[PDB]
Design a protein around this ligand. Structure first.
Ligand SMILES: Nc1nc2c(ncn2[C@@H]2O[C@H](COP(=O)(O)OP(=O)(O)OP(=O)(O)O)[C@@H](O)[C@H]2O)c(=O)[nH]1
Ligand SMILES: [Mg+2]
Lengths: 950, 466, 170
């Protein structure tokens, strides 16, 4: 009967599946009653209700605050009376609840504070701080957790006066109790040395105190913490070394405990102090170094210490970057003791990796290729940081240890094979200056010889009949991959038949890394200033067929199920690269290769699984078509189109944007539309083809290719204009609409366009009033320039005026000349600028009909021609839905249409404009410049003289 | 969801103190405001009230002596002699009596604010000012010292002194030959110029700039210290205040003083020069033409950390200027030292070298050879390293530098037909790609969005090499 | 289905939680995005070598405005799946928020972190970035509701954890 009893009833029902949704609808109805907020608080406090019902009430109250406490402007939405009573009850209520309920009320307080603190809740800070006591560490944890939730909001903020005022307010209340409480927790931890339960509680409080210590120091080191630094950091200094058998258990290797987290939080704070407040922290840094050195010395290799180890190494890395503190271990003794104690024990190959090698080879390869927070990586980055500060010392110290690793291996290669993996790894890390990139390694350590190390240590392991462990075979191949830029062409050529032979083995990682290394060798450029690759077609032609034959056999090796066939994308990436390098070397085999790729497409269509495999399959098809003689395209086309039609009819959306690109390329390269492709033209225009974002770029390209190659394939232009309308009306697809329109206007005879030219202009300009974007107006301006440059100034005027006489001059003076100087894309800027100039110097009708437009047009021209790289350079988060992704095929990519190729966008534009203006002035009997100069702004009269006298 | 605006996240030139609120412990590099000029009380009070001139003098001399070199200020006040001392400064009193009375009052005003209040409420200030007109050189020296302590006590007494028209007679003192008079008057003058909120009446204290232009041509260290501090206060202002300093042709000698032997001189001189380059490009070029860039190069190696910091801040407001001014910085060989500080200096200094390099890269978008040279000098690695430790504002500034560097590399790739963006490869080589990528974990949305754009624009598996 | 478990499925809007459940329920792949309103509870039955196991999947709403009871759904949950979309970096950035709210209600339940949509080429959240599961001792899986990659791994791990039998098989 009661309203409290009724609220509790449906709070309870909300935990049960059959009533989860109805209970919420009932509660939302009960929620309209005034005081529902306070009714929830009374339910939460009712110890006679089951805990789950009270928890449902605490969660509902919390989310009630988040929904209905304030509107977007910060106006309280509850009656002013309820608001103040909530703020008065909530803190005392929080204290009285057990943990599971207490934390949710703490979060509701934090949510209220998000909007009301500090201006509209002045009592909160005193309210919270007054609940801390020396004898109740449970209540302390709860209160401190609320404080941390509020104060940690400072961490992502930019400094400001308003923020520092807020921080000052908090410090005045908390500094004394915070330090005192911190000074009390350390005392009770020692007194309770053998009380497990009380220890876990005390360290829970310590963890939040450490996090709060960070909150108070994340913007600047406040005066209080500078003055009291010795006691504060002194305490943390202590617990970095603390060890208690009760708070540990060797039987757990993954789950980091509160003690582990406390030391990690301490190391976070120590690195903050070391990197931001070294001036204040300096005197104490040496103590933390020594304790960090001892901490890493006696740390178990169990993963549960991984984070602590990396946070310690990042601290030591920050210390390595401070010269004063790097010198304490910038000598052979210390550097050698770091090596033996810190780095080497963590760089050895751990068997948690060897198992990934055997059980999930493809994943091992992907992670090896791209790489964090493993001890190996954390320690190797530390090793790099040291090398950067003293290369000679670090290198020689490791060359000494590696010398002994060689002897350990040569003595018993079968058992000590892991030692050879070690010094290959170490040698690589020491030899590379910085990190390897997608382009390889660009420079190496002058104290090491990668070619010598290759000849002596790597090459023998490639061809040795027996290998102590296939991991060393992989290490050898990976060395070639890593140092490919450091080997000569002749050395690489000698390796090509060896790597190719690996493609006939059964070891997953060996033949995959071999394929990867071949592919990367074929991507090495001769230099960055020309496109030529080191490997030309004559360097691969004699092995192209056998490489492709073996790569295909590896793809098919484990069965032709869609998921297994497509498993290894590196095989198909290598096929693509081989094809690209070989060009027309094996043209006679193109029909058979293409038939094999088409069969792969057919199998994968049952379940597309690997998008990278799929992508490079179609890249490979694109490469074949790119190197096929044009008169042989129809025969290849005919062998593909049955499968492509099935891709449409079965709606295999993963392949549809690739098929559209391939077909478009074929049409672009043919003098006529192949007969098997003609039936697609008019179905292409159905609106349902243009619904998915992932297909639009591809079907736009296909439609453009039909228009260019043979626009008579479209007997009716109405549905073509219907596509243009659909694209141009859309903010998302407007760019494709302009791209289509350019093809329409420039490539279809005007006799055909005549009945539609007014409608085209109306559609194009409707966006200006309804829903114009900045990109739209920029693209419209470029489009005007393109029309002017090609069809002429008179055409453009009568194209726009056909919509409404007078519209040309209105759009020109409002949109075109105002927008021209803001166009940042360099090719678009040239087209627009030259097109606008063309109106003045090659538009006698423009001059005679709109004489008063010339001055403002010239101001825009001069400003645009006399101006920057600061402008937005391109025309570039959201929910992915099925089919929303488009992937461009580089094998058949097209460069943008430049109608003004004799004018480089870099410096030719400015020179062109100046020469065109001088010429026009000369043709005018030297009256244009003199007549227009006084009509320009002061600023542009100067810029113009710099152009002409330039 | 509503939050206070300063808890939301959704011209490169920087003025002295755009944000005054501080959490850090205040560290004073400024000269102490007040200065002191190094029981038979009943009997002295009887002589001071006596009608005899020689009895008055002997009493005044005694009160001055006990107040010299600690001094029982509150005890002298309790004797009720302060108004009598003030009477001894009146225009119709003997010269030596005026001298002693003014000296004694100077030291009473040298103590607490309550003790200064005693002298001020006794109407001493109009008489000090008068003694600056009528006194001998010895009298003028005592009166100007007294006015320094009043002015140095608070902005209110500073303004009261100025409201009494003290500036006109004070500015007449600087024709004296006595180095001790010039020293004291320069310190008092710096006290009249000191104080930010409220600032002194500009129409009055800007009348001192011609005199300050002369004073910085002193070779007395103490005089130069307080003269440069005075100029540093007056130059802390908008373009109008900077222009008044330029008009009196102070910058040339101010720049010369950056190379003074004493860091007590370099500090205020550098502060004043820093203030001047917060205006516009034209005002900044006046300082460049005075030779500030070679002088700044040496200060980047100064043993005083705060000198290095202020030198970087000054350079950063120069590289906030135009292409030619950025090139001038490069031409003065200032980048190698900046890059060095960017990797080894204390954070507050390192942070300022970041602003300087970042601002230069913003103008380097118009002269790509600027960014080439920056990259050539190895700035990429220090910038990337700074991403891991810096406050959120400096993260944003550092990402903007890296974005400019990437834009230039991309524009260069397209202009020259290069295969890859060379600066993107340098950044990845230096380990910077991962450190930019990790900025996407920041809850600050501006930082996240910038890092995301950089990663997706320049490192997003763009293309297969063809 | 007499062995029953309350499983809460949470994650940002559009990450594929409903598509994933419906694929398990009927085998159909849903192409359209129809945001879930609060929760929909779906029973999933697996026939194992230890008998039939039933998961009552509380498929919750990821969009805040449709969140319904939000973490009110987590009360007495015995396991959970946190989902994100490997093509949307922001959905992984929000994983700690979902995990924090879960463990505040359910201290010690087994939780599987699922990175969905690995069938899409433009993957933004690489394995390198995916480290949250080691910091909080969650099991992680790449999955694809579209291609059925690792389709059953989340429920299999939870079932083994819940029954305490590493040899349980579906
Ligand atoms: N390509 C691809 N798309 C998927 C996959 N899984 C889901 N989707 C698509 O992603 C979109 C999101 O679908 P939903 O399952 O309804 O998203 P949700 O997580 O339930 O979102 P909310 O209910 O609002 O919390 C739909 O368009 C799905 O078709 C996948 O594995 N691969
Ligand atoms: Mg859903």
């Amino acid at each position: 009967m009661s309203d409290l009893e009724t609220v509790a009833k449906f709070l309870a029902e909300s935990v049960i599946a059959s009533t989860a949704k109805t209970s919420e609808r009932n509660l939302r109805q009960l929620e309209t009653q005034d005081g529902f907020g306070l009714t929830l608080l009374h339910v939460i406090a009712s110890t006679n209700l089951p805990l789950s019902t009270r928890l449902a009430g605490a969660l509902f109250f919390k989310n009630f605050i988040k929904r209905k406490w304030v509107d977007e402007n910060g106006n309280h939405l509850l009656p002013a009376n309820n608001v103040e009573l909530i703020k008065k009850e909530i803190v005392p209520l929080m204290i009285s609840l057990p943990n599971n309920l207490q934390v949710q009320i703490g979060e509701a307080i934090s949510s209220i504070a998000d909007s009301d603190f500090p201006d509209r809740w002045p009592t909160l800070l005193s309210d919270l701080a007054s609940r801390l006591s020396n004898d109740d560490m449970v209540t302390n944890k709860g209160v401190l957790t609320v404080a941390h939730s509020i104060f940690k909001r400072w961490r992502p903020l930019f400094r400001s006066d308003e923020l520092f005022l807020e921080i000052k307010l908090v410090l005045d209340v908390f500094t004394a109790p915070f330090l005192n409480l911190l000074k009390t927790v350390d005392e009770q931890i020692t007194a309770n040395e053998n009380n497990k339960a009380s220890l876990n509680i005390l360290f829970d409080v310590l963890l939040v105190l450490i996090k709060l210590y960070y909150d108070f120091n994340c913007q600047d080191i406040p005066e209080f913490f500078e003055d009291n630094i010795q006691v504060g950091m002194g305490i943390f200094h202590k617990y970095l070394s603390y060890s208690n058998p009760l708070l540990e258990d060797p039987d757990e290797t993954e789950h980091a405990s509160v003690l582990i987290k406390v030391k990690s939080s301490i190391q976070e704070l120590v690195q903050l102090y070391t990197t931001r407040y070294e001036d204040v922290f300096g005197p104490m840094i040496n103590e933390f170094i020594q304790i960090t050195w001892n901490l890493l010395t006696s740390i178990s290799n169990q993963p549960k210490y991984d984070i602590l180890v990396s946070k310690s190494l990042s601290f030591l890395t920050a210390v390595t970057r401070i010269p004063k503190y790097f010198e304490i271990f910038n000598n052979e003794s210390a550097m050698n003791n770091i090596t033996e104690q810190i780095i080497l024990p963590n760089v050895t190959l751990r068997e948690e990796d060897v198992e990934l090698f055997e059980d999930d080879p493809i994943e091992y390869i992907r992670r090896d290729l791209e790489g964090t927070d493993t001890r190996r990586r954390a320690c190797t980055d530390f090793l790099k940081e040291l090398k950067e500060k003293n290369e000679v010392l670090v290198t020689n110290i490791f060359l000494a240890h590696m010398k002994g690793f060689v002897d350990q291996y040569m003595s018993d290669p079968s058992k000590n094979w892991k030692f050879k993996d070690l010094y290959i790894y170490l040698f690589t890390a020491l030899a590379i200056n910085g990190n390897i990139t997608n382009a390889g390694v660009s420079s190496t350590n002058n104290l090491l010889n990668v070619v010598d190390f290759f000849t002596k240590e790597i090459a023998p392991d490639l061809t040795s009949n027996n290998i102590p462990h296939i991991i060393l075979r992989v290490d050898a191949i990976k060395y070639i991959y890593t140092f490919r830029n450091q080997l000569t062409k002749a050395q690489l050529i000698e390796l090509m038949p060896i790597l190719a032979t690996f493609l006939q083995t059964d070891e997953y990682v060996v033949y995959t890394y071999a394929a990867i290394t071949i592919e990367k060798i074929l991507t090495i450029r001769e230099s960055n200033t020309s496109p030529a690759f080191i490997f030309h077609k004559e360097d691969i032609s004699n092995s192209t067929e056998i490489l492709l034959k073996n790569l295909i056999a590896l793809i098919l090796k484990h069965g032709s199920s869609p998921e297994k066939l497509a498993e290894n994308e590196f095989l198909m990436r290598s096929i693509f690269r081989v094809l690209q390098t070989s060009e027309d070397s094996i043209q006679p085999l193109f029909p058979q290769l293409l038939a094999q790729f088409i069969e792969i497409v057919t199998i994968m269509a049952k379940n597309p699984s690997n998008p990278r495999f799929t992508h490079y399959t179609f890249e490979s098809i694109g490469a074949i078509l790119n190197y096929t003689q044009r008169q042989n395209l129809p025969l290849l086309v005919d062998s593909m189109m049955p499968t492509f039609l099935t891709v449409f009819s079965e709606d295999i959306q993963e392949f549809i944007p690739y098929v559209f690109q391939i077909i478009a390329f074929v049409v672009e390269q043919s003098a006529t539309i192949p007969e098997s492709i003609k039936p697609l033209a008019q179905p292409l225009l159905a609106p349902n083809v243009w619904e998915l974002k992932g297909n639009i770029p591809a079907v736009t390209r296909l439609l453009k290719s039909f228009i260019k190659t043979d626009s008579s394939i479209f007997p009716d232009l109405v549905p073509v204009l219907g596509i243009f309308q659909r694209l141009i009306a859309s903010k998302a697809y407007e760019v494709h609409g302009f791209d289509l329109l350019e093809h329409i206007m420039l490539l279809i005879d005007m006799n055909r366009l005549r009945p539609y030219i007014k409608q085209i202009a109306v559609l194009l300009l409707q966006r200006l009033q309804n829903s114009k974007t900045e990109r739209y107006v920029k693209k419209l301006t470029v489009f005007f320039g393109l029309i002017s440059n090609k069809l002429g100034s008179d055409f453009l005027i009568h194209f726009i005026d056909e919509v409404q006489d007078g519209l040309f001059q209105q759009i020109w003076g409002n949109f075109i000349i105002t927008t021209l100087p803001t166009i940042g894309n360099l090719l678009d800027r040239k087209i627009a600028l030259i097109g606008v100039l063309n109106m003045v110097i090659n538009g006698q009708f423009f001059q005679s009909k709109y004489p008063t437009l010339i001055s403002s047009t010239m101001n825009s021209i001069i400003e645009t021609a006399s101006s920057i790289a600061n402008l937005k350079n391109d025309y570039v988060e959201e929910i992915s839905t099925f089919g929303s992704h488009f992937s461009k095929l580089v094998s058949i990519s097209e460069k943008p249409f430049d109608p003004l190729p004799e004018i480089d966008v870099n410096n030719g534009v400015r020179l062109y404009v100046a020469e065109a203006l001088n010429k026009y002035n000369a043709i005018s009997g030297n009256t244009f410049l003199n007549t227009i100069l006084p009509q320009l702004t002061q600023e542009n009269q100067v810029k113009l003289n710099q152009l002409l006298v330039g | 969801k509503f939050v206070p605006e300063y808890r939301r996240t959704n011209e490169l030139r920087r003025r002295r103190d755009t944000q005054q609120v501080e959490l850090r412990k205040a560290k004073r590099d400024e000269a102490l405001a007040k200065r002191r000029n190094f029981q038979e009380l009943p009997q002295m009070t009887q002589q001071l009230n006596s009608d005899d001139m020689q009895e008055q003098l002997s009493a005044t001399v005694k009160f001055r002596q006990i107040l010299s070199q600690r001094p029982p200020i509150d005890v002298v006040i309790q004797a009720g002699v302060v108004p009598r001392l003030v009477e001894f400064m009146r225009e119709n009193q003997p010269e030596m009596l005026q001298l002693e009375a003014a000296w004694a009052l100077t030291n009473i005003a040298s103590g607490t604010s309550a003790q200064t209040k005693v002298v001020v409420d006794a109407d001493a200030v109009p008489l000090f000012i008068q003694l600056l007109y009528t006194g001998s050189v010895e009298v003028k020296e005592q009166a100007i010292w007294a006015l320094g302590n009043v002015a140095g006590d608070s902005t209110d007494y500073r303004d009261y002194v100025l409201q009494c028209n003290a500036m006109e007679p004070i500015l007449g003192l600087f024709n004296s030959n006595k180095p001790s008079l010039i020293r004291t008057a320069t310190w008092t003058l710096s006290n009249l110029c000191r104080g930010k909120k409220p600032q002194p009446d500009w129409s009055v204290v800007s009348q001192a700039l011609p005199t300050l232009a002369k004073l910085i041509y002193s070779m007395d260290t103490e005089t130069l210290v307080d003269a440069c501090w005075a100029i540093s206060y007056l130059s802390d202002g908008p373009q109008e205040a900077i222009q008044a300093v330029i008009d009196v042709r102070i910058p040339k000698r101010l720049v010369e003083l950056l190379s003074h032997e004493s860091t007590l001189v370099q500090t205020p001189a550098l502060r004043a020069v820093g203030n001047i380059v917060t205006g516009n490009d034209l005002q900044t070029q006046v300082v460049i033409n005075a030779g500030v860039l070679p002088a700044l190069r040496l200060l980047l190696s100064s043993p005083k950390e705060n000198i290095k910091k202020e030198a970087c801040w000054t350079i950063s407001n120069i590289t906030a200027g135009n292409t030619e001014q950025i090139q001038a910085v490069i031409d003065a060989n200032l980048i190698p030292p900046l890059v060095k500080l960017l990797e080894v200096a204390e954070y507050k200094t390192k942070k300022e070298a970041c602003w300087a390099i970042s601002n230069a890269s913003s103008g380097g978008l118009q002269r790509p050879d600027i960014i080439r040279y920056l990259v050539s000098q190895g700035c990429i690695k220090p910038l990337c390293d700074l991403l891991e430790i810096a406050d959120n504002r400096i993260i944003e500034v550092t990402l903007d530098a890296l974005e400019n560097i990437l834009k230039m590399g991309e524009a260069d790739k397209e202009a020259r037909g290069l295969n890859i963006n060379e600066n993107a490869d340098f950044i990845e080589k230096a380990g910077g790609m991962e450190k930019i990528f990790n900025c996407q974990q920041n809850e600050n949305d501006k930082i996240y969005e910038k890092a995301y754009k950089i990663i997706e624009t320049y490192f997003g598996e763009e293309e297969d090499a063809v | 289905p007499q062995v029953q478990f309350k499983l809460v499925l949470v994650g940002d809007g559009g990450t594929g939680k409903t598509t994933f459940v419906k694929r398990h329920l009927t085998g159909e792949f849903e192409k359209k995005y129809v945001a879930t309103l609060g929760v929909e509870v779906h029973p999933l039955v697996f026939h194992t070598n230890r008998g039939p196991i039933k998961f009552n999947v509380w498929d919750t709403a990821g969009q805040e405005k449709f969140g319904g009871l939000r973490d009110g759904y987590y009360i007495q949950a015995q396991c959970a799946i946190i989902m994100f979309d490997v093509t949307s970096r922001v959905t992984y950035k929000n994983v700690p928020n979902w995990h924090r709210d879960l463990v505040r209600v359910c201290e010690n339940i087994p939780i599987v972190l699922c990175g969905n949509k690995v069938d899409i080429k433009d993957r933004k959240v690489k394995a390198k970035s995916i480290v949250f599961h080691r910091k909080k001792n969650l099991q992680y899986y790449d999955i694809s509701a579209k291609s059925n990659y690792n389709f059953e791994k989340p429920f299999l791990w939870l079932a083994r954890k819940l029954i305490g039998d590493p040899n349980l098989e579906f």
